Structure formats: C-alpha cells, structure tokens
Structure 1
Amino acid sequence: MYGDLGNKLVLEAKRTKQLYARSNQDVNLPMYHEDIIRNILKEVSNLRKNTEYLKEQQQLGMLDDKVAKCQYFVTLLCMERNKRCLLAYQRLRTDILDSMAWNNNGLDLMSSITFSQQDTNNLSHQEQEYLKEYCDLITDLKSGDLVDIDLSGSLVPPSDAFIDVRVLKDAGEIQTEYGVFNLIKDSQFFVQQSDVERLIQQGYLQLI
C-alpha cells in the first residue's frame, strides 16, 4: 500500500516487453503514462515533505530518539523504491526506443527523421527531445565512418549477393541513389543486395 503503485507501474511496464518479445515487433507503444507517475511524484513529494518536517522535529521535539532513526530509514527506502520503479520503467522505454532509432534510420539517405514511430505525439515530448537528440547523436557516428555505414542496416548478412524484390504498392520511382530503379507497382527487380538493404526498410520491397 505504501510503495505498491510502483509495483503496478512496472507490472504495466512488463506488458510492453511482452509486446516487444515474440512479438511481433511493430512498435506502437500505447502511451507514456504521465498521470500515474504524477500520482507517484505527488506521493513522493508528500513523503520527502514529511521527511524534512520530521527532520526539523528531531532538532526540537524528538531529541534524537532511537525510534526517529526508523522514519529516516524506512521512508527513505520508499523514495528509493519509487526511483527503482521510475528508472526501471524509463530505461525500458529507452530500450524499446533507441533500438527503433537503430534498425531504421531509415535508410539511404536517411534522409530526415519523419513519419516514423507511430507513437508520434502520443508519446511524451520529453522523450522525443531525447530521441531527436539521440538520432542527432548517431549522425556523428554516421559521420566518423568512413567504413562505410550503412551501419543502421545489414544486421543480417548478404546472400548471394543478388536477390529478387517484388513491388508492394509503392510509387515510385523514387530510387535516385545509384540508379533510377523506376519503382512500379507489380514489378520485381533482379537487383544486388546493395540497394535492397536500403530500400527494404522503407517498405517498398517485399520478398527477399
């Protein structure tokens, strides 16, 4: 009853892992809960308020009682508990997030972060600032190599090395890089793994 709201919150955190697990991974997190954590923050503010109040009270009334210690001990733990929840949730949220910023940006010619992440505005803007700052953070890693990467893609090794892509209602032709593949619905291109990696992440290509 004391710290249990955090147990319920992480209990809810669990279900997003369930949605990232088997899964199938489309992202589409329901929302970030600002309300329930606001409840948590009001509860914890309550706590630390009574804490500094009693911290004033030992200075006068309690007179360093053996019992007093407990309040600064036990209730202190509760603060930690909320923290233990609040970060555990939060890191989970960053884990479901940064990976998404990994596997697709997105990809050639990124060329900008847009239309991605169906959560969009529904997810908190505090995370989105972190996010845009994070893909800005990875643009520098993109700019060191020079390898080249091409890192966001090709988690799965090339074979061999030409494939066949069957158009999937995409228009097209938007293939400007390397060559004008001239995208055309109902058209399969006997194209090398090279531009396939880049174009398959967008949603144009279908069968590898």
Structure 2
Amino acid sequence: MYGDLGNKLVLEAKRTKQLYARSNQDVNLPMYHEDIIRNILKEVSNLRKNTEYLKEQQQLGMLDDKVAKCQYFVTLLCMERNKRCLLAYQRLRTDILDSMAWNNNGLDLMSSITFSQQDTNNLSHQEQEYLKEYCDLITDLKSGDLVDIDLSGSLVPPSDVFIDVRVLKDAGEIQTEYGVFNLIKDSQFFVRQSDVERLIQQGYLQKI
C-alpha cells in the first residue's frame, strides 16, 4: 500500500539496466525522477508523523501495548522498504555515471570538451557534483605511482604493430613524437598503432 509507489521507481531502474545491458555503444541516462522521489519523501514524512502520533497516544496510556506494536512495526517496515527502493535506484544511476567517467580518459567531462554522449540536464545537481569529484579522483590517481602506465588507456590487447587508418573529421597539422601528421579529410594513413590510439579514441580516425 504505502510502498506500492516505490515499486514503480524500481521498475524504471530495470528498464535503464536493459539500456545499459543492450548497449553496443555508450548511451545516455534518461530523465531524473524527482517527482516520484518527492512523492516517496512525502509519504515517508507522513509515516514519521504517524509514528510520532502513535508515540504520544501510547504515552498517555489509552491503548494497549500489543496493539501499538503492530502499527509501529508496519510503519517501520514501510519506511525501510522505501529506503531500499531509493537506494537501489541511486546506486544503479551512480554505477552508470562511474562507468562513463572512466570511459572518457579521465578529464573533467561536461566542463571541458565531451564526446556528446550525455546531455547536461538529465543528471541531478548532486549527481553533477558527484561526477566532478569522481573525475578529480581519477585525475589524481593517474598522477600517482603509476605514471608510466596510462590507467585510462585502451583495454583491448595489442596484436597488430602496423595498421591502416582513415580520417573522419578535418583538422590541422599535429606534432607527434619525432614527426608530424597532416589530417586532411578523406585521406588514408599507414602508421604504427601506438601513435593513433589517442586520435581514434577521440573520433578523428577510423578503422584499426
């Protein structure tokens, strides 16, 4: 009864999980559910008022204790269920955010240039804050003892020394260690894989 609304929220989470599960490429979180969450907040506030009222009505001594225990337990259980639903929804959304934050080579995400995967207004303000400190944590990890290893690098094993690549978007001359790449659009390169991993990750190159 009281928790029947929160179940709906959990159902929404399930749908999001499917979009996370069936994702060939990175996806965007849907709109926040502040209205449903505020409805659970209102009903848990009403439950708190009911618990208070039971407290006074018992402590004036008009009702039997065994009777009051049952509604006390019911209100406590309903509040626990609502907390569980809200926490599960929040943790799923948090996990997806952490995954995206890791899958953009660290960086500040929305403030700096982003891969346009996510719109600003989908996330909540607290989620926007959380993402910022998580990105800072990734950043000061990457400057730790593991400087030589790029903790935000590619996770597919290297098995091809020389690859053919094609430019997707036009750009200017870019210096690389001991040379220069000229990014004329609709041109093909035959070069070592290590040099162009960064440019492939950022969408300026195609193929491998």
Q: TM-score range by the shorter chain?
A: 0.7 to 0.9
* CA shift in 2, pair 1:51/1:156, >3 Å: same
Report the RMSD for the aligned CA atoms in angstroms. 2.8
- Looking at structure 2, the residues matched to 180 and 25 of structure 1 have their Cα atoms a distance apart, in angstroms, of 31
Q: Secondary structure at the match of 1:166?
A: strand
Contact 2:168 2:186 in 1 (8 A): yes
- Looking at structure 2, the residues matched to 73 and 80 of structure 1 have their Cα atoms a distance apart, in angstroms, of 10
* CA shift in 2, pair 1:131/1:116, >3 Å: farther
The Cα offsets for residues 125-164 of structure 1, whole Å up to 9 and x where unpaired, read as 1101000110001111101043423211211111222322
Q: Write out aligned runs for 1:151-190 (5 A).
A: 151-173=151-173, 179-190=179-190
* CA shift in 2, pair 1:59/1:47, >3 Å: same
- Shift in Å, 1:12: 0.5
Paired residues, number: 208
**Structure 1 stretch 178-187 or stretch 67-76: which is displaced more?**
178-187
- Looking at structure 1, the residues matched to 160 and 73 of structure 2 have their Cα atoms a distance apart, in angstroms, of 63
More strand as a share of residues: 2
Any gaps of 5 or more consecutive residues in structure 2? none
* CA shift in 2, pair 1:18/1:138, >3 Å: same
**Structure 1 stretch 29-38 or stretch 17-26: which is displaced more?**
17-26
TM-score, length-scaled by structure 1: 0.87
Any gaps of 5 or more consecutive residues in structure 1? none
Q: Secondary structure at the match of 2:41?
A: helix
Q: Secondary structure at the match of 1:180?
A: strand
**Structure 1 stretch 11-20 or stretch 173-182: which is displaced more?**
173-182
- Shift in Å, 1:176: 6.0
The Cα offsets for residues 47-81 of structure 1, whole Å up to 9 and x where unpaired, read as 11211221222111455510211122121111111
* CA shift in 2, pair 1:108/1:69, >3 Å: closer
- Looking at structure 2, the residues matched to 51 and 62 of structure 1 have their Cα atoms a distance apart, in angstroms, of 16
* CA shift in 2, pair 1:201/1:61, >3 Å: farther
Contact 1:7 1:85 in 2 (8 A): yes
- Shift in Å, 1:43: 0.9
Q: Secondary structure at the match of 2:189?
A: strand
Contact 1:107 1:198 in 2 (8 A): no
* CA shift in 2, pair 1:132/1:10, >3 Å: same
- Looking at structure 2, the residues matched to 31 and 41 of structure 1 have their Cα atoms a distance apart, in angstroms, of 19
* CA shift in 2, pair 1:167/1:111, >3 Å: farther
Contact 1:163 1:190 in 2 (8 A): yes
The Cα offsets for residues 75-118 of structure 1, whole Å up to 9 and x where unpaired, read as 11111111111110001001111011112126799994646542
**Structure 1 stretch 114-123 or stretch 19-28: which is displaced more?**
114-123
Contact 2:2 2:43 in 1 (8 A): no
Contact 1:62 1:68 in 2 (8 A): no
- Looking at structure 1, the residues matched to 45 and 152 of structure 2 have their Cα atoms a distance apart, in angstroms, of 42
- Shift in Å, 1:30: 1.7
